[PDB]
């Protein structure tokens, strides 16, 4: 099986060589595209916080959409632009089910070699451009945004490693789900909450309490109250309100 793997690995290197040659230009662009939507959200946030506070001040003293549509058109443009900076790349480099199938077959042929060499830890790095690309403009609180269950990375991996055998603490697939959710999704969720969420929307606030509990209830082993990244996520949510009062 190493001889067939050697053939496969040499084919893989050429396959990845075209990807990385392309990526030499596209890796700076990932940072640029991520900055572009965040600055656009910053433009949205700076304009809307200033104007809506004046509206809320009048409304609160009483009791004591145009920009959003314009923003959505440019947000969709950046979303499509991000998918067009990666449209000139083969489907096999971004279809997560195709990638998963290769590594599952790799483990199915070389279980000992996959577990001992921690080959599964290469998956979050290969998915690192992919997860950042898919979660780029994503914010599940908006009226036209997809839920986290409606993405390739979550659905394919939701039962990955959830085998009927007793969960060993060092089983690479059993450890894959904590690693991707805690170390990749939660920092991304922190960046999303700090730079993209608009706390004044009551509807988003209703979704916020629901969606936070949903993640905790779906992964009580990982997304628990003791988890430092979950704590960082919970702390960031409160701090975003503070900054929203400062701006």
């Amino acid at each position: 099986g190493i001889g067939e793997r050697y053939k496969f690995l040499q084919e893989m290197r050429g396959y990845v060589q075209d990807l990385l040659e392309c990526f030499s230009e596209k890796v700076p662009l990932i940072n640029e595209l991520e900055s572009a939507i965040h600055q656009l959200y910053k433009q949205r946030a700076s304009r809307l916080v200033q104007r809506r506070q004046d509206d809320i001040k009048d409304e609160s003293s009483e009791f004591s959409s145009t920009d959003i549509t314009n923003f959505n058109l440019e947000k969709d443009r950046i979303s499509k632009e991000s998918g067009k900076v990666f449209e000139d790349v083969l489907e096999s480099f971004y279809s997560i089910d195709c990638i998963k199938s290769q590594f599952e077959a790799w483990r199915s042929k070389y279980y000992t070699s996959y577990k001992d060499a921690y080959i599964g830890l290469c998956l979050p790095k290969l998915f690192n451009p992919l997860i950042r690309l898919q979660l780029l403009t994503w914010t599940p609180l908006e009226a036209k945004c997809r839920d986290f269950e409606n993405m390739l990375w979550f659905e394919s991996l939701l039962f990955y490693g959830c085998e009927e055998r007793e969960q060993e603490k060092d089983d690479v697939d059993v450890a894959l789900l904590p690693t991707i959710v805690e170390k990749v999704i939660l920092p991304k969720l922190t960046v999303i909450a700090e730079n993209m969420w608009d706390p004044f929307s009551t509807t988003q606030t209703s979704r916020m309490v629901g969606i936070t509990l949903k993640l905790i209830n779906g992964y009580p082993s990982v997304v628990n109250a003791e988890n430092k990244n979950t704590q960082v996520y919970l702390k960031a949510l409160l701090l975003r309100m503070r900054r929203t009062l400062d701006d």
């Binding site: 190493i2 050697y6 690995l9 040499q10 290197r13 990807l19």
Partner: peptide
């Protein structure tokens, strides 16, 4: 960037490991 060195390393490791597996086969 990391994928270039890491994936190619496995190719060079497999060529070495074939000699190592043969050495381990011979020893056993």
């Amino acid at each position: 960037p990391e994928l270039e060195h890491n994936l190619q390393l496995l190719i060079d490791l497999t060529e070495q490991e074939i000699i190592q597996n043969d050495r381990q086969l011979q020893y056993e």
